[PDB]
Amino acid sequence: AKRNIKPFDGEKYAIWKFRIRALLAEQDVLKVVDGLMPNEVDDSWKKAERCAKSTIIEYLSDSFLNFATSDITARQILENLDAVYERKSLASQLALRKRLLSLKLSSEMSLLSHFHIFDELISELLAAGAKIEEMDKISHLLITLPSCYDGIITAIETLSEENLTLAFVKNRLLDQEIKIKNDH
């Protein structure tokens, strides 16, 4: 159905997995991957499993068929791909946190690309066994900015830590980005 999914070439596994899961959810098949295996399986379950396996095999590049050649269901294929490409290791978290704690904003880059990079790093941390909530994301985003945003950083941190959301902080930062680009 959806043909905007680039075949898995070993790069950007999160995006491919998300698009495959969305496409499966379109066809009322995502219950196979997530839902528990019923004690008795009927024709509908078999058809759903066949459709999920066919879709996953179709959206895998030629070199990656070996993840599906064996007699393994779609959920097993996704589990194997997740284990190979999204592994929960403390070393990965420790390596990624140092990059996240040293991610300054370059002058030539706008806050939209910087926000995209920061969100990519946060999602990569969350892929491993990390527990980062909204407040930690806000704190990292605030500490990953140059000195021109000191006023908004001081003002935002004074706000109560119960209604703060990442979108609100991002909008407040973009407003001062617009203000700052005028004063430089």
C-beta of 119 vs 136, nearer to a copy of itself = 119
Closest CA to 118 of 134, 99, 135, 93: 99
Report the Cα 32 to chain-centroid distance in Å: 22
Query: Contact between 172 and a copy of itself (CB under 8 A)?
Result: yes
What's the closest the beta carbon of residue 144 comes to a copy of itself, in angstroms?
A: 16
Q: Where are the alpha helices (DSSP H) in the chain?
A: 13-26, 30-34, 43-58, 74-85, 90-100, 111-127, 134-143, 150-158, 166-182
The per-residue DSSP string of 124-166 comes to HHHHTT----HHHHHHHHHHTS-GGGHHHHHHHHHS-TTT--H
CA angle 133, 35, 14 (to 5 degrees): 45
Q: Residues in contact with a copy of itself, total (CB under 8 A)? A: 65
Query: Contact between 179 and a copy of itself (CB under 8 A)?
Result: yes
Query: Contact between 139 and a copy of itself (CB under 8 A)?
Result: no
Query: Contact between 54 and a copy of itself (CB under 8 A)?
Result: yes
What's the closest the beta carbon of residue 138 comes to a copy of itself, in angstroms?
A: 13
Place of tokens 């430089």: 184
Query: Contact between 85 and a copy of itself (CB under 8 A)?
Result: yes
Site residues (vs a copy of itself, CB under 8 A): 1-2, 4, 6-7, 9-10, 12, 14-15, 18-19, 22-23, 25-26, 28, 46-47, 50-51, 53-54, 57-59, 62-69, 80, 83-85, 87, 89, 91-92, 95, 98, 112-113, 115-116, 119-120, 123, 165-168, 170-172, 174-176, 178-179, 181-182
